Amino acid sequence: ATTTLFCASDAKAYDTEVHNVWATHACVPTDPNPQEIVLGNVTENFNMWKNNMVEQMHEDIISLWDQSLKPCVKLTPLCVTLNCLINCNTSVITQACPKVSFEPIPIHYCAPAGFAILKCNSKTFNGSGPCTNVSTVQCTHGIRPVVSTQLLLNGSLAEEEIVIRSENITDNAKTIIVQLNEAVEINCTRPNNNTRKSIHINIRQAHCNISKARWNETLGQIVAKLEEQFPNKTIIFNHSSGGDPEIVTHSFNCGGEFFYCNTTPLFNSTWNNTRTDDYQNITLQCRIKQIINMWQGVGKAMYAPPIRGQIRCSSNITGLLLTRDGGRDQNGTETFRPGGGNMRDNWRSELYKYKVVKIEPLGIAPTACKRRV
Amino acid sequence: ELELTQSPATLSVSPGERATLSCRASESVSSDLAWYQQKPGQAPRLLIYGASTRATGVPARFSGSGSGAEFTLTISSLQSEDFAVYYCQQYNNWPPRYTFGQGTRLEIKR
Amino acid sequence: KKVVLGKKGDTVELTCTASQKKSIQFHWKNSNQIKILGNQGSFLTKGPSKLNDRADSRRSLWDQGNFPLIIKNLKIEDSDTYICEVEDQKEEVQLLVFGLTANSDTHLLQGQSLTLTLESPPGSSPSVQCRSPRGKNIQGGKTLSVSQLELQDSGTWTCTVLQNQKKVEFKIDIVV
Amino acid sequence: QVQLLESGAEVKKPGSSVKVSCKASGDTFIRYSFTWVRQAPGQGLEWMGRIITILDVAHYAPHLQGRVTITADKSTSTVYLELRNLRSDDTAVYFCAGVYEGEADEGEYDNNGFLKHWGQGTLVTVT
Ligand SMILES: *[C@@H]1O[C@H](CO)[C@@H](O[C@@H]2O[C@H](CO)[C@@H](O[C@@H]3O[C@H](CO[C@H]4O[C@H](CO)[C@@H](O)[C@H](O)[C@@H]4O)[C@@H](O)[C@H](O[C@H]4O[C@H](CO)[C@@H](O)[C@H](O)[C@@H]4O[C@H]4O[C@H](CO)[C@@H](O)[C@H](O)[C@@H]4O[C@H]4O[C@H](CO)[C@@H](O)[C@H](O)[C@@H]4O)[C@@H]3O)[C@H](O)[C@H]2NC(C)=O)[C@H](O)[C@H]1NC(C)=O
Ligand SMILES: *[C@@H]1O[C@H](CO)[C@@H](O[C@@H]2O[C@H](CO)[C@@H](O[C@@H]3O[C@H](CO)[C@@H](O)[C@H](O[C@H]4O[C@H](CO)[C@@H](O)[C@H](O)[C@@H]4O)[C@@H]3O)[C@H](O)[C@H]2NC(C)=O)[C@H](O)[C@H]1NC(C)=O
Ligand SMILES: *[C@@H]1O[C@H](CO)[C@@H](O[C@@H]2O[C@H](CO)[C@@H](O[C@@H]3O[C@H](CO[C@H]4O[C@H](CO)[C@@H](O)[C@H](O)[C@@H]4O)[C@@H](O)[C@H](O)[C@@H]3O)[C@H](O)[C@H]2NC(C)=O)[C@H](O)[C@H]1NC(C)=O
Ligand SMILES: *[C@@H]1O[C@H](CO)[C@@H](O[C@@H]2O[C@H](CO)[C@@H](O[C@@H]3O[C@H](CO)[C@@H](O)[C@H](O)[C@@H]3O)[C@H](O)[C@H]2NC(C)=O)[C@H](O)[C@H]1NC(C)=O
Ligand SMILES: *[C@@H]1O[C@H](CO)[C@@H](O[C@@H]2O[C@H](CO)[C@@H](O[C@@H]3O[C@H](CO)[C@@H](O)[C@H](O)[C@@H]3O)[C@H](O)[C@H]2NC(C)=O)[C@H](O)[C@H]1NC(C)=O
Ligand SMILES: *[C@@H]1O[C@H](CO)[C@@H](O[C@@H]2O[C@H](CO)[C@@H](O[C@@H]3O[C@H](CO)[C@@H](O)[C@H](O)[C@@H]3O)[C@H](O)[C@H]2NC(C)=O)[C@H](O)[C@H]1NC(C)=O
Ligand SMILES: *[C@@H]1O[C@H](CO)[C@@H](O[C@@H]2O[C@H](CO)[C@@H](O[C@@H]3O[C@H](CO)[C@@H](O)[C@H](O)[C@@H]3O)[C@H](O)[C@H]2NC(C)=O)[C@H](O)[C@H]1NC(C)=O
Ligand SMILES: *[C@@H]1O[C@H](CO)[C@@H](O[C@@H]2O[C@H](CO)[C@@H](O)[C@H](O)[C@H]2NC(C)=O)[C@H](O)[C@H]1NC(C)=O
Ligand SMILES: *[C@@H]1O[C@H](CO)[C@@H](O[C@@H]2O[C@H](CO)[C@@H](O)[C@H](O)[C@H]2NC(C)=O)[C@H](O)[C@H]1NC(C)=O
Ligand SMILES: *[C@@H]1O[C@H](CO)[C@@H](O[C@@H]2O[C@H](CO)[C@@H](O)[C@H](O)[C@H]2NC(C)=O)[C@H](O)[C@H]1NC(C)=O
Ligand SMILES: *[C@@H]1O[C@H](CO)[C@@H](O[C@@H]2O[C@H](CO)[C@@H](O)[C@H](O)[C@H]2NC(C)=O)[C@H](O)[C@H]1NC(C)=O
Ligand SMILES: *[C@@H]1O[C@H](CO)[C@@H](O)[C@H](O)[C@H]1NC(C)=O
Ligand SMILES: *[C@@H]1O[C@H](CO)[C@@H](O)[C@H](O)[C@H]1NC(C)=O
Ligand SMILES: *[C@@H]1O[C@H](CO)[C@@H](O)[C@H](O)[C@H]1NC(C)=O
Ligand SMILES: *[C@@H]1O[C@H](CO)[C@@H](O)[C@H](O)[C@H]1NC(C)=O
């Protein structure tokens, strides 16, 4: 089916939190008694890159960002139907910019009246491969609408082992979604201590820390899986290959603070079966920006200056988006640069277990009876 | 729109005396007020920005404070070159709809 | 296959075509399967090749269905084919960049001979068609030489270079 | 670091179009915004408008939007002020005004609404 799904999140309806305001006006309360009917010996071809359900969540989040962070100047392109000097003049919009609170909330996409949602339960699932432990439900699990690049933040973890998912390997175009089985933490702060606005005619500085003794374990398992796909080549990580500032670096949000964290001291290491890092607090240098590029279409934007102080992001890291650099010049190597940017790929890593199906009840079969006439 | 009101029309001063000024807004406004100087036929040099931070080159003789509606200013040890027209220009509305202020001037006994 | 010509220094614009009119994923790969550009949602990712700072794209036309490839400061080393990967198609074009000039910079006289210089891309066969304002429509292969360079031979001769029914014009520095 | 250079003091009949230019140096033209303040003879400091160099946007007063427009030719680093539909009240002194913004190209923009750098003023008078 190609239907719409009503959301169902546990709101509050009293605080000035943005997601609590949005969830109260368009969401219902969560199901207090869920029922997961386990089917028998069934098999369903769960394709995940052709899932139309993720095309809906992406259009239900864009409608939230137009109710949350109103830009001061929303510069967006607009062309005129003239064959080819095509008339393409920008159309700016000036709106009030109030600094509002910002925090995601887990939502649940539920099936409408008359349809059902299937769900695989295999601990591997492979992506677009048919599983066997298919069970039906009515609402998905907790899904957070976190918007980020190069590192999938807050969310669900793998069941037993770090699995990799990609629509098609060896074609270096499709992004490789890597799901972790252990929550890698990350803390990002800037207390006060940097009220220095300009330098010559810092408040635009922040940092993050990653537990090196814990992060190497999860990275050590990723290379163990990637080498299973390429045993003779060499796994060599690298930084980004350039482009827009929202892709070259990490990018997440915390109360309107658009942290653009430089992730070069996290992917610089070359690899083999042994380590090449060192031998606790990896200082991930970040920077608050003001002129961004929207992820909800082409076009720049400009927000209000940052808050005075005490900006904290006690996050998690459940996924990882990695691209691949192949070719005829690939002399026994494997380059996995950080990618991401396509937010649909951010939610396909979350909505991979589900599928919306309808029940057709007719059926025709041959038999040995005959209508007496 | 908004309006900035000054209490005096001119300011009776003398060299070596302390001078104070105040700007009042028609509506509420935060600490986004800047004080400007003005000399005849010259460029209106910046004095304070944000009502509490001096520019690059403004001496310690010029200072001010205040928030909300009242915005004070103080001039310690009024020099000879400090006799110039002063101005109040508010900027706290997005889109920019701020207009102007009245302004004061130091006096000369004659 | 489509093919265009470069002028050793200017830009170029190789375009793809889309019909869904939705601004979807696409890429650009050379003859060695190396990424150059490509949409990633609504952002832009420059692929790891030898054309990092030269590759660019007109972002304002992606929602209409046109995904051009803007490459500035063309060189002869970039004469290679390119691949479009809009939906599932493999729209392929070919780039041929070369430069036509001479050797004697400014010191020239009256009654001297002239020589030309062409650095064609490796694996090509161009045809240089010279044209002069005096009517010296010199026809020949790649290399051309003129035996007369006088005061009457002044003016930048517009020698065009044709290959596969595709030609581009140039200029000639003549200082006497 | 930055400097300004106004245009020539030209008088025009009320009803025509007025153009005022301002060049600069010392810093890249797209690093910070620019404004316009109107100095009438004997009056205060009337705010004309404001233009961001990167985002070619402009905001004006509600009594001037049908007569002014600001462009920032970054290839020449010269802001222009096309003031058409000239009247008699518009006799004043026009001048550019700038204020630095820390690294707006990379995105560290500050939205400094005050004014620090000023030009010298061109004389505009109708007859
Ligand atoms: C992944 O998931 C994790 C969760 O597992 C996400 O982590 C969350 O991230 C949130 C934002 O990054 C963060 O939210 C902040 O929490 C602060 C602490 O909350 C606790 O204290 C409050 C008050 O005591 C309790 O009510 C509450 O129950 C908690 O126990 C809040 O204080 C923060 O609110 C302030 O910041 C936002 C930022 O925009 C403001 O909009 C908001 O209005 C508040 O602003 C005030 O404080 C700032 C601090 O400097 C001031 O600068 C500002 O001017 C305001 O100051 C006024 O008020 C203070 C009193 O608060 C007063 O002293 C001052 O004088 C002023 O009058 C904010 O809500 C979550 O805590 C955090 N969760 C966890 C578990 O860590 C993570 O983000 C996820 N990843 C992503 C990408 O989202
Ligand atoms: C992570 O990816 C980046 C992608 O940019 C990669 O960095 C670059 O790699 C290329 C590929 O080797 C380097 O290019 C060459 O590097 C050598 C060594 O310095 C230079 O001598 C070369 O310059 C000469 O050769 C060119 C022709 O090959 C000539 O045209 C040129 O004029 C010079 O004569 C050539 O540049 C490039 O230097 C690096 N750049 C950086 C900043 O590292 C990086 O290697 C990847 N990481 C890992 C771990 O592999
Ligand atoms: C999953 O993705 C894979 C890559 O991401 C896909 O692999 C592709 O598989 C096809 C089938 O072999 C390959 O096509 C081959 O291309 C060569 C090279 O073509 C050149 O030479 C021929 C003449 O030899 C010429 O006509 C052309 O114009 C080229 O100049 C051909 O010679 C072969 O006959 C064959 O067609 C692709 O190369 C390969 N992709 C890559 C990037 O290597 C795979 O198909 C995907 N899976 C599914 C199910 O679609
Ligand atoms: C096939 O799919 C079904 C989906 O329900 C799987 O059943 C689930 O199995 C897990 C064990 O991994 C059960 O979790 C356990 O629950 C019990 C009782 O609640 C508790 O004592 C344990 O601590 C643990 O939490 C889960 O309850 C169970 N689902 C239901 C509805 O009972 C089944 O395991 C899958 N088959 C295979 C081979 O994985
Ligand atoms: C993220 O942080 C890393 C920290 O290493 C930054 O890498 C460093 O960037 C600087 C600036 O380009 C590089 O300096 C340059 O080096 C070349 C020699 O290759 C020299 O010719 C230049 O004049 C300049 O000094 C520096 O080499 C580089 N570090 C390494 C190890 O390569 C990186 O730029 C940051 N990225 C972002 C997006 O913030
Ligand atoms: C790739 O990035 C990692 C990021 O951690 C680099 O590891 C860091 O390497 C530097 C080497 O200079 C370590 O500094 C060391 O500090 C100790 C104590 O102050 C000092 O005794 C040493 O002489 C050295 O200066 C740094 O601690 C280390 N990071 C962590 C978190 O331990 C790694 O070197 C990078 N690799 C490449 C090839 O760029
Ligand atoms: C590596 O990073 C972590 C966090 O990014 C650092 O942990 C932090 O360490 C400081 C220093 O002890 C802790 O402050 C102390 O907290 C206790 C408990 O509230 C308080 O009673 C003390 O007076 C003091 O303020 C801080 O809480 C702690 N962070 C967290 C989240 O617990 C760690 O120190 C870093 N490693 C190194 C070697 O610096
Ligand atoms: C895991 O997924 C891959 C594709 O993502 C499946 O691979 C194809 O499987 C069919 C039949 O199993 C083969 O005919 C194809 O040749 C396979 N293609 C590739 C590229 O491997 C694979 O079957 C899935 N695993 C399971 C257990 O179903
Ligand atoms: C990031 O911060 C969190 C808390 O904000 C840290 O979690 C605590 O870690 C200490 C060990 O240093 C434990 O004793 C605490 O019990 C943890 N908190 C909770 C609630 O369990 C975390 O260690 C920090 N990680 C990094 C890499 O900085
Ligand atoms: C993030 O990591 C940095 C780098 O280790 C921490 O800075 C250190 O903090 C400890 C205790 O606060 C000091 O003893 C070290 O001297 C600091 N290192 C440096 C280089 O200054 C920082 O504290 C960490 N963040 C948090 C929230 O703890
Ligand atoms: C981030 O990771 C921490 C653990 O590193 C998560 O904390 C766990 O939360 C579950 C949820 O019920 C508890 O059962 C565990 O006992 C917690 N462990 C610890 C050590 O605190 C935390 O929930 C993660 N954050 C998010 C948003 O998922
Ligand atoms: C599924 O197959 C197993 C294999 O023995 C069988 O025992 C079971 O009854 C089957 N399920 C159903 C619902 O019949
Ligand atoms: C990863 O780091 C931890 C310390 O944080 C260390 O105990 C462990 O041995 C490291 N992993 C490898 C493979 O060396
Ligand atoms: C490459 O890997 C295969 C196993 O996948 C192994 O048999 C072979 O020996 C390896 N090549 C070399 C040169 O060792
Ligand atoms: C990587 O490790 C293997 C042994 O696991 C070794 O044979 C190989 O030489 C190593 N690669 C390099 C480049 O040293």
Coordinates of N, CA and C in Angstrom, one line a residue, chain C residues 57-123:
Chain C
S57 N 28.7 23.0 -10.0 CA 27.4 22.7 -10.6 C 26.4 23.8 -10.2
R58 N 25.4 24.0 -11.1 CA 24.4 25.1 -10.9 C 23.3 24.4 -10.0
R59 N 23.4 24.7 -8.7 CA 22.4 24.2 -7.7 C 21.0 24.6 -8.0
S60 N 20.8 25.8 -8.6 CA 19.4 26.3 -8.8 C 18.6 25.6 -9.8
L61 N 19.2 24.6 -10.6 CA 18.5 23.9 -11.6 C 18.2 22.5 -11.3
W62 N 18.5 22.0 -10.1 CA 18.3 20.6 -9.8 C 16.8 20.2 -9.7
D63 N 16.0 21.1 -9.1 CA 14.6 20.8 -9.0 C 13.9 20.8 -10.3
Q64 N 14.4 21.4 -11.4 CA 13.8 21.4 -12.7 C 14.1 20.1 -13.4
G65 N 15.3 19.5 -13.2 CA 15.6 18.3 -13.9 C 16.9 18.4 -14.7
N66 N 17.7 19.4 -14.5 CA 18.9 19.5 -15.3 C 20.1 19.5 -14.3
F67 N 21.0 18.6 -14.5 CA 22.2 18.4 -13.6 C 23.4 18.7 -14.4
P68 N 23.8 19.9 -14.6 CA 25.0 20.2 -15.3 C 26.3 20.0 -14.5
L69 N 27.4 20.0 -15.2 CA 28.7 19.8 -14.7 C 29.6 21.0 -15.1
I70 N 29.9 21.9 -14.2 CA 30.7 23.1 -14.5 C 32.1 22.8 -14.1
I71 N 33.0 22.9 -15.1 CA 34.5 22.7 -14.9 C 35.2 23.9 -15.4
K72 N 35.8 24.6 -14.5 CA 36.6 25.8 -14.9 C 38.1 25.5 -15.1
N73 N 38.7 26.3 -15.9 CA 40.2 26.2 -16.2 C 40.5 24.8 -16.8
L74 N 39.9 24.6 -18.0 CA 40.1 23.4 -18.7 C 41.5 23.2 -19.1
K75 N 42.0 21.9 -19.0 CA 43.3 21.5 -19.4 C 43.2 20.3 -20.3
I76 N 44.3 20.0 -21.0 CA 44.3 18.9 -22.0 C 44.2 17.5 -21.2
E77 N 44.7 17.5 -20.0 CA 44.6 16.2 -19.2 C 43.2 15.8 -18.9
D78 N 42.2 16.6 -18.9 CA 40.9 16.3 -18.6 C 40.1 15.8 -19.8
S79 N 40.7 15.5 -20.9 CA 40.0 15.1 -22.1 C 39.6 13.6 -21.8
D80 N 38.4 13.4 -21.3 CA 38.0 12.1 -21.0 C 36.4 12.0 -21.1
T81 N 35.9 10.8 -21.1 CA 34.4 10.7 -21.1 C 33.9 10.9 -19.7
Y82 N 32.6 11.1 -19.6 CA 32.0 11.2 -18.3 C 30.6 10.5 -18.3
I83 N 30.2 10.1 -17.2 CA 29.0 9.3 -17.0 C 27.9 10.0 -16.2
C84 N 26.7 9.9 -16.6 CA 25.6 10.4 -15.9 C 24.9 9.2 -15.2
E85 N 24.4 9.4 -14.0 CA 23.7 8.3 -13.3 C 22.5 8.8 -12.6
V86 N 21.6 9.5 -13.4 CA 20.4 10.1 -12.8 C 19.5 9.1 -12.2
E87 N 18.8 8.3 -13.0 CA 17.9 7.3 -12.3 C 18.5 5.9 -12.4
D88 N 18.7 5.4 -13.6 CA 19.3 4.2 -13.9 C 20.0 4.2 -15.2
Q89 N 19.9 5.4 -15.9 CA 20.5 5.6 -17.2 C 22.0 5.8 -17.1
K90 N 22.7 5.7 -18.2 CA 24.1 5.8 -18.3 C 24.5 6.8 -19.4
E91 N 23.8 8.0 -19.3 CA 24.1 9.1 -20.3 C 25.5 9.4 -20.3
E92 N 26.2 9.1 -21.4 CA 27.7 9.3 -21.5 C 28.0 10.3 -22.6
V93 N 28.9 11.2 -22.3 CA 29.4 12.2 -23.2 C 30.9 12.1 -23.2
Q94 N 31.6 12.8 -24.1 CA 33.0 12.8 -24.2 C 33.5 14.2 -24.3
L95 N 34.6 14.5 -23.6 CA 35.3 15.8 -23.5 C 36.6 15.8 -24.3
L96 N 36.8 16.8 -25.1 CA 38.1 16.9 -25.8 C 38.6 18.3 -25.7
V97 N 39.6 18.5 -24.8 CA 40.1 19.9 -24.6 C 41.6 19.9 -25.1
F98 N 41.8 21.0 -25.9 CA 43.1 21.2 -26.5 C 43.4 22.7 -26.6
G99 N 44.6 23.1 -27.0 CA 44.9 24.5 -27.1 C 45.8 24.8 -28.3
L100 N 45.4 25.9 -29.0 CA 46.1 26.3 -30.2 C 46.8 27.6 -30.0
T101 N 48.1 27.7 -30.3 CA 48.8 28.9 -30.1 C 50.1 28.9 -31.0
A102 N 51.0 29.7 -30.7 CA 52.3 29.8 -31.5 C 53.5 29.8 -30.5
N103 N 54.7 29.9 -31.1 CA 55.9 29.9 -30.3 C 56.5 31.3 -30.2
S104 N 56.7 32.0 -31.3 CA 57.3 33.4 -31.2 C 56.3 34.3 -30.6
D105 N 56.6 34.8 -29.4 CA 55.7 35.6 -28.6 C 55.4 37.0 -29.2
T106 N 56.4 37.9 -29.2 CA 56.1 39.3 -29.7 C 57.2 39.7 -30.7
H107 N 58.4 39.3 -30.6 CA 59.5 39.7 -31.5 C 59.3 39.0 -32.9
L108 N 58.7 39.8 -33.8 CA 58.5 39.3 -35.2 C 58.8 40.5 -36.1
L109 N 59.1 40.2 -37.4 CA 59.4 41.2 -38.4 C 58.5 41.1 -39.6
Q110 N 58.9 41.8 -40.7 CA 58.2 41.8 -42.0 C 59.0 40.9 -43.0
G111 N 58.4 39.9 -43.6 CA 59.1 39.0 -44.5 C 59.6 37.8 -43.9
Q112 N 59.1 37.4 -42.7 CA 59.5 36.2 -42.0 C 58.5 35.1 -42.1
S113 N 58.8 33.9 -41.7 CA 57.8 32.8 -41.8 C 57.2 32.6 -40.4
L114 N 56.0 32.0 -40.4 CA 55.3 31.8 -39.1 C 55.0 30.3 -38.9
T115 N 55.0 29.9 -37.6 CA 54.8 28.5 -37.2 C 53.7 28.5 -36.2
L116 N 52.9 27.4 -36.2 CA 51.8 27.3 -35.2 C 52.1 26.1 -34.3
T117 N 51.4 26.0 -33.2 CA 51.6 25.0 -32.2 C 50.2 24.5 -31.7
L118 N 50.0 23.2 -31.7 CA 48.8 22.6 -31.3 C 49.1 21.4 -30.4
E119 N 48.5 21.3 -29.2 CA 48.7 20.2 -28.2 C 47.4 19.5 -28.2
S120 N 47.2 18.6 -29.1 CA 45.9 17.8 -29.2 C 45.9 16.8 -28.0
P121 N 44.8 16.3 -27.6 CA 44.7 15.3 -26.5 C 45.2 14.0 -27.0
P122 N 45.8 13.1 -26.2 CA 46.3 11.8 -26.6 C 45.2 10.9 -27.0
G123 N 45.2 10.4 -28.2 CA 44.1 9.6 -28.7 C 43.0 10.4 -29.4

